[PDB]
Amino acid sequence: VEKLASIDAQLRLLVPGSEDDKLVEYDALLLDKFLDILQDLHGEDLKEAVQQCYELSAEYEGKHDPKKLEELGSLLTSLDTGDSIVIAKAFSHMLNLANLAEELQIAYRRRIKLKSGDFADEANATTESDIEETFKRLVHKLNKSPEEVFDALKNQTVELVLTAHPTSVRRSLLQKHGRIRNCLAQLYAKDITPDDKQELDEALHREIQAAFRTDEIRPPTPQDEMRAGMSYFHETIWKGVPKFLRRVDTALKNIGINERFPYNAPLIQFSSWMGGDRDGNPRVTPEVTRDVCLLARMMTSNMYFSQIEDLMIEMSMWRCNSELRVRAEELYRTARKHYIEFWKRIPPNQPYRVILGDVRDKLYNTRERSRHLLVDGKSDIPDEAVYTNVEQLLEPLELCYRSLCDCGDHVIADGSLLDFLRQVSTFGLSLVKLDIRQESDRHTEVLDAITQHLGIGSYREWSEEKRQEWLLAELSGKRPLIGPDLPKTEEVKDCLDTFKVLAELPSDCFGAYIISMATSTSDVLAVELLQREYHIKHPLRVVPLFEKLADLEAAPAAMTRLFSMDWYRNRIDGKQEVMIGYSDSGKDAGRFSAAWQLYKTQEQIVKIAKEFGVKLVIFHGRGGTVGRGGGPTHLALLSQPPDTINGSLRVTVQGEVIEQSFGEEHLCFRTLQRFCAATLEHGMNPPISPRPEWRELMDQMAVVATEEYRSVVFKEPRFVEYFRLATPELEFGRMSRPSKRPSGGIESLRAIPWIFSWTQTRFHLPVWLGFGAAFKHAIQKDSKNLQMLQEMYKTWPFFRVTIDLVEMVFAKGNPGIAALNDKLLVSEDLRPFGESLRANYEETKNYLLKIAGHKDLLEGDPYLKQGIRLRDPYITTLNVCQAYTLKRIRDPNYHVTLRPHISKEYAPGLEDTLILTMKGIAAGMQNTG
Amino acid sequence: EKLASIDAQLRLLVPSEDDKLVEYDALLLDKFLDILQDLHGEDLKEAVQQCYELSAEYEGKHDPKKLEELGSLLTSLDTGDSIVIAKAFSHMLNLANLAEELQIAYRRRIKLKSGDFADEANATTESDIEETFKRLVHKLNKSPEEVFDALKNQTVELVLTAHPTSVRRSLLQKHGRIRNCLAQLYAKDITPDDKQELDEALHREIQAAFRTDEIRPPTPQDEMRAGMSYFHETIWKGVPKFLRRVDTALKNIGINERFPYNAPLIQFSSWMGGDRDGNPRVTPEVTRDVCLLARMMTSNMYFSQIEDLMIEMSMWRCNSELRVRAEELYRTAKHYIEFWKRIPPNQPYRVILGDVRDKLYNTRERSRHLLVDGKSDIPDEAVYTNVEQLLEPLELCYRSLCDCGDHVIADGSLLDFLRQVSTFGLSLVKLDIRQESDRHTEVLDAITQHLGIGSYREWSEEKRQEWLLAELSGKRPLIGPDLPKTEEVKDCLDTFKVLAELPSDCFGAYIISMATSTSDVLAVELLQREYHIKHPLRVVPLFEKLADLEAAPAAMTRLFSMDWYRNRIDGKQEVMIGYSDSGKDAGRFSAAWQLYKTQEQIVKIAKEFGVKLVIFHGRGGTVGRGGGPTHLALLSQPPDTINGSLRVTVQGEVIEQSFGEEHLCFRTLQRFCAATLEHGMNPPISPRPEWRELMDQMAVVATEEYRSVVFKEPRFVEYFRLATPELEFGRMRPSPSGGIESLRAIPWIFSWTQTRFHLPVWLGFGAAFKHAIQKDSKNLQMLQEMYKTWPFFRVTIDLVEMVFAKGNPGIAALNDKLLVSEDLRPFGESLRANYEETKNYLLKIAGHKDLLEGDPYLKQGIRLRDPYITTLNVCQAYTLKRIRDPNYHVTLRPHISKEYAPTSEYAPGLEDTLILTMKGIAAGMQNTG
């Protein structure tokens, strides 16, 4: 009768339970159904094996008895390659289930009705403010008129830049995840028949299996990796955006604005790095970039195309204004179809349809030109027949729209037509615009080739002042720099060709050219010059990304110098965007010192832009508090230094967060919602400025933290051998892209790998190291600092948000895993070094607690804690499995007695098991640094 | 918990929406087990579970092995442990019945009903009072005024008899508390804490019941003082609630006034201390005492609530009529305390009600002193000797209120109180007297012989009549103080001295058991005259044997022919009938049909002589079933047999179901009132002559079979004495030499109910059905049309069907095997064969595959009780063996119950175990014949 109630009972033990809190039930059902499936497919024997692992991991998660971990080891390590693959798949798959259940729980959790009004409320989905509440706060708590709010909003832009998953999932598998999540959602609805329940049951059972059996063993091209993206948009964002904008409309009613948000106001914009970012990544060629533009153009046209037919059916009206009636007549007159819904000709009896039919053909053509260009390279298709610019596509829709209003039918015009206008206006002809990123040294290499080939010396050898002097001269040069007959290395050709691609393609494909490892004025001019050389008609804006602390300290001088140049001031036309990267900067100096430095740098650069009349946009690269997703993003955005958003947000949406943020319609909606709300609020309601005591203490702690971080990571010569052993970092490095930009050392290692290696291991060093020294030293210098730190946590959003993130990571941390790793993988001489780090973990964690005023991690956030506690047993099993696998890979001569093979049925090795393991853990850990 | 498991194993017994019964039973059982553990130890708890598991397993499959395994267990228990098990199961039953009461109470009514009369056989589909009114008005062209009028003149008298085995006022209230705790545990918006506390409340109250189990006989006085509980508990409040519903129902058909508060719609009566038929414990002094108790307690009830009405009646505006009488009372210038003060005429309603209170108190005290001393120094002036005296001041208040513009207030508690007073009078119940005809003969014979004029016994009926009428107008007494009297004749004569001394509002009817003739009734009239009873009780013949029924019409005709009698009865005669009694003579079937005809004939006869005839339904009817079935049973009565006046026995074994829970109480009252009303305006169809004819034919055959087996077969009584606890019941009222004709009906029915075989209820139906079908296969169709179309027939078959559902021939078989000698077993086998064949014909006629297809809810109720009953049957059977048999002993298990804490009879505790058993079974079986 009842496997489930028991599985529920044994799942409750992990987190004690309440009202709309279904998570444990959800997880229980999913798990119980999943076990049956393992039984059918692989046999009782294996099912038990899987349960045993779970029981052990769970028992471990409760008490934390290192014995349990070893028992688990004995089990996992005794499995042949075949069975371990299966277990690895199993746990890796129960995780994805646990995440769906959590998405669903988060989606339907009840909002708190009366909120404290504290800014802390904005760090949690249940208490944060929706758009209407935000408007109201601004109007009533801040004396802004509705008109002023409406106005702010009309001018606001929010750009979400999508990056590729650092490990990324299949469009099929997504949809199974959706179907499973829906079956589950549906099983919990009252007024549900025994039959429907029975049928939903088998539907659920079936869709889990279908997912489990979609598990083929692999690398994939940038093109496919990107063609991935065009899914999530279909799946959720494409529909999400109109839904949200309609909510904006409703919210404006309720504060007394009697009009809808203009359909062409560019409130929300999307962008991408996929096929764009070539930094330390030679797989991203010019041809790749040409292909992702054409794909983007294609698919977008296709989307507009597959829904136009539905709008056409809906638009059965015959009453129109004359403006339209003319243009319809024209179009019927000029007539004399590959697809089928409307495969016929259409009576001018129904004019809206005539227009939209033309639109459809044009969309189809636009689809086809991009398709042929993509596969052939030529296409015999006139610009006349096709949308080369979004205005061309809006125009007929605006026509219909106006016509409807004029005939007295605005109410109808504000239905699907409006949604469609909003989609077109948000997504344009290219769903995402592509950013280009390359590292400064590359532009230097190119310019050096040029200068040397010209016989004038070596750009590399020149001083900054010289580079600037030369660059400006040539920026007004009266004759080209570059011949066809210039000697080029493959890299230089690759780089130059990227500009040939930028010149050939329509500019509505592209966003910014980001310069990785920027450090100077010359770095930006260099890119400007090459754009001029290739006669790019609408050059992309150049965006320096300042990474290292020193580079951040130098940035203000660099920006000031830029803004001092008339050539440059006039090219940028009042607008500059600068990029920052929390992970990057924190790899240099620790997370703490990087956080603080970035606060100040933004402040200074804002001040500098203000002085020169420049609107400054700060592009948030990965690693922020602001890329967490969920409520915490809400507060993180409000926590930003004053005037740093100023109506224009641009942030990275880290791949490892795209599912949480967008994969479910409600979360999708609220993601969009908070980005828009927070951005709006901030420009009219900055956080308080830090008290000077706080700046002073923060400066003092930064030095100590950076000292500790660098002591351990760069100064200590034992560290890299430790890292290489205690961590799958090397094995990761036989992949996404070369994680060492072969030079050797941590400074050489890229940040994603850095973060990822220590996340696998549950130890998370890159995120907390240096916080402990900083805290300890500040308290030991003066016990009154504890009070100050606490006041800072209570009152200073930046600080709060900074500590919450590190707290969340400790909650996903477990030093026992780190300890097991030492014991299995690390040599006897390095173990005390490990012990030492674990000691620092603990001490850091405890200070962090003392400062937030919590006994236990996440007291402020039981729901998040519950989510984590539930995932853990699964992750733990993967950690352990991983650890022994790493052993067997590294040590050809480690062997133990293998249990006779357990899986039934009715070529793969350790490396395959390790990948499964790396991906399960990564998906269980989501974002950290 | 282990509840879900107990729920799971309870579901198996009966495989939905508001169907909580299984949960209810599960919880109760799980709580009850814990209690057995605490009090008696794991060891015993398991023993109890084992019995339950076995019984349940048995109830599903019906494997005789299970029964034997159970036997081995039960028969291996020492006297100490078997007592405990017997208490346990006997107590789980009472729990199961409370749960069922609760389930029945809250089951949902069907909203659209077929309109068929079958709908009235089930609580979910039967008609409430409003629906009845509406049917009458719309489907039958009666004006609201005509309905209202019918109702105003309608009387419903419920005569309460004593439980044939009866429960304690304390224990009732525990049953109530348990039932409420349970009801409360199932309510949403309920806290973890309230749930926790209700849990322990529940747990506690079960234990308190379980530990209220002392071993004993009790006096008629106490047995009756029992009654005065159920009224307190439920009827006292029930009546006003229902009458208020009548009021609401009258609104909704457009009558704009309330049911008159003094219209005697509902009246109650009792046999307790009244019925002395074959029961010499019921002496004259007993009868005196139950009148005085009744008078006392009733005064007390009025008294304990008056104080609450007085507080409520804080008004000061009154009419003059009242204001005078108040002034008077204050002008004319306290043991208890609520109002222990004097009262300002400032508040006049209170002044009146204070007087009323004192008068009620005095009335209470006089009855109390008379009861314990025999004299009381208390003037009639100080006291209510007549209900009008108590109404008058209430009507005063009532009128005053309406006159001051406060009728709305007057229709609150005051109205309730008026209704109570008017329904219950000064004596909650009126007492009927019953004695058997032969006794009056014995008395008159003593008299005639002492007078020297011969022997009344020897005289012919014509002679008796001639003498009786002469003496009924005699001009001088019959009886001296000097008359020779046996203890019986004195007992009988003293009863009349008691009737003459006590107020007439204490009494109802004098029922003559074993009536047969006109003289039988005149005899009683004469003795009443002799004792100068100022308001003689009406004489009611109870005709029992079939012959006595066939002779009744001639007897009634003769009575109605006598001017002496016609003028004494003043237009009204009541006649009693007794289904069980008559069915003990001739079989249930022939008795049913004969009673249909007798009623018809006697009705006809009364109609001809201008006499309003009331038929007093004694026990055994379809009409004493309680629940919906009663509803249809009443509607099924022959035309004109109710004629505005229903009088029916409420069998003791049905009082709990009918009244113990406020909702069932209300609906019991409801259907009695509704059915009665409807019938006088909407009789059932009259039987088709073919049907009469076939019924007459089947009656002969059925009587033949019944009498063949019971009276003609000389082996029968030895069979009965062995297969049945009948003898042991007979060491209890005396159930002097025997034979079955001698044995009383309750014992007859009860003996075969214990045994789950139920012979008295079905025997003879099988022969009748078989012979009718074998004479002519077209009869089957006729029988089925009768079942479909003729309420009497339907109702008659449903009852027998219900009994088969409570039947189990395996128990009967086990009994034979354990208790009956080898030579009589084939006789048993033969009866079991008849059981089967009868059951199967009965099914074939109702058109059912299985028993109770028409009634899944009832079947569920039975299925759930059964395992408990089965355990008691088995326990019982072996106990009966050990009692009867010197040659039986088996190895006893070492004692199982723990404990911390002479009483000898026949065998050392067996007799006690048997009683427990007899009472558990009886309470699990409720009503059958």
Ligand SMILES: O=P(O)(O)OC[C@H]1O[C@H](O)[C@H](O)[C@@H](O)[C@@H]1O
């Ligand atoms: O961090 P990397 O290893 O350079 O990899 C790529 C990431 O780098 C930076 O930190 C950027 O700020 C992000 O927009 C990007 O996802």
Ligand SMILES: O=P(O)(O)OC[C@H]1O[C@H](O)[C@H](O)[C@@H](O)[C@@H]1O
């Ligand atoms: O023991 P008995 O002869 O049945 O007497 C007791 C019963 O007798 C008759 O059947 C009456 O109709 C009942 O009102 C009463 O309960």
